[PDB]
Each structure stands twice: as C-alpha cells, then as structure tokens.
Amino acid sequence: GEIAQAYKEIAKALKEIAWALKEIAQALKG
Amino acid sequence: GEIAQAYKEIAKALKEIAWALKEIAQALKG
Amino acid sequence: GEIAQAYKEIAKALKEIAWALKEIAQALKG
Amino acid sequence: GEIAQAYKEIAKALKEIAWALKEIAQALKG
Amino acid sequence: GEIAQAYKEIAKALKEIAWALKEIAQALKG
Amino acid sequence: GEIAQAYKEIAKALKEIAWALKEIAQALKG
Amino acid sequence: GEIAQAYKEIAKALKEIAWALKEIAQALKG
Amino acid sequence: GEIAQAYKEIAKALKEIAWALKEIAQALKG
DSSP states (O other): OHHHHHHHHHHHHHHHHHHHHHHHHHHHHO | OHHHHHHHHHHHHHHHHHHHHHHHHHHHHO | OHHHHHHHHHHHHHHHHHHHHHHHHHHHHO | OHHHHHHHHHHHHHHHHHHHHHHHHHHHHO | OHHHHHHHHHHHHHHHHHHHHHHHHHHHHO | OHHHHHHHHHHHHHHHHHHHHHHHHHHHHO | OHHHHHHHHHHHHHHHHHHHHHHHHHHHHO | OHHHHHHHHHHHHHHHHHHHHHHHHHHHHO
C-alpha cells in the first residue's frame, strides 16, 4: 500500500541520516 | 493520495538532513 | 486537507533543520 | 481540528530546533 | 482528546530538544 | 488507550534526548 | 496491539539515541 | 501487517542513528 511504502521511504531516509553520522565519525577519527 | 504524498515530502526532507550532515563531515575532513 | 497540510508543514520544518545543519557545515569550513 | 493543530505544534517545535541549530552555527562562526 | 494531548506532549518534548541545542550554542560561545 | 500511551512513551524518549543534549552542553562548558 | 508495540519499539530506539548522546557527552568530558 | 512492519523499519533506522552516534562518541574518545 502507498502509506506503508511512504513509511518505508521515511525509514530509508533515517538510514541515510545514520550513514551521514557514520561519515561524521570517520571525519573526527582523521 | 495527499497523505502518502505528504509522507514522501517528509522522507525527502529527512534525506536533505542526511545531505546536510554529509556537508558537516566534509567540513571536518577539511 | 488540513492533516496533509499539517504534514507538509512538518516537512518544511525538517527542511529548515537541514538548512541550519548546512549553516553549521559552513561555520566549520571557516 | 485538534489533531491537525497538534501536528502544526510539532512543526513549530521542529522550526525551533532549526533556530537552535542556527544559534550553534553562529557560535562556531564566533 | 488523549491522542491530540499525546501529540502536544511530543511537541513539548521537541521544544525541550530545541532549548538543549540553544544551551549547546551558549556553551560553544563561552 | 494503548496508542496514546505509546505516543506518551515517544514524548518521554524525546525528553531523554533533550536531557542528553544538556549533558553535551555541560561537557563543552567544562 | 501490533501498532502500539511498533510505536513502543520507536520509543526504545529514541532512548538508544539519548544514551548514545550521553556517550558523546562523556567523550567530550574526557 | 504492512503498517506495523513499516513502523518497525523506522525503529530499526532510529537504532542505526544511535549506533552512528556511538561511533561519533568513540571517535571523540580517540
């Protein structure tokens, strides 16, 4: 359904935020 | 539908937050 | 509808958060 | 309606988070 | 209603996050 | 009701995020 | 119910974010 | 159900944000 699919897109966007925060960790380590 | 479309706009906004966090990572790497 | 319009306002507010995080990146670059 | 109004209060709170992040940017620029 | 009241509590909690981020800005300024 | 109670638990968790951000502010002030 | 249980899992995940932010505060204090 | 499953994916994504924040803490401790 389109609502569950839109919530899945929100989950994917939150995973992109997590990946960006991992990139911040890597930048701090350097 | 307008509700699923509004949730998709929330997902797009969350992706923009991820992009901004990546810009923070790049600024720290410099 | 008023609910979809309120979700659109939440998306706009999340975009403002993304813009503020971009401003943080610019501040770190300086 | 009370639900749409409550979602609008969530949007206003998210905008306050954006303003606070801008204050962080300004503190880093100083 | 109890659902709108619970969303209002979420908005108040997001405002507390904004205030804490303002406290971070003040800490960086010092 | 169980849904309003679950939303209240989300608000409490968001308040814990605010408290944690205040601990970050205090760590920067030291 | 499965929806209230899923919202409870979201609250638990937000508490994990708060704990991680407390870990950041501890790292800054050191 | 697909909606509860989508909310569980949002919780998992929020947990990934917590893990990423822990990686930030570890980078600061180094």
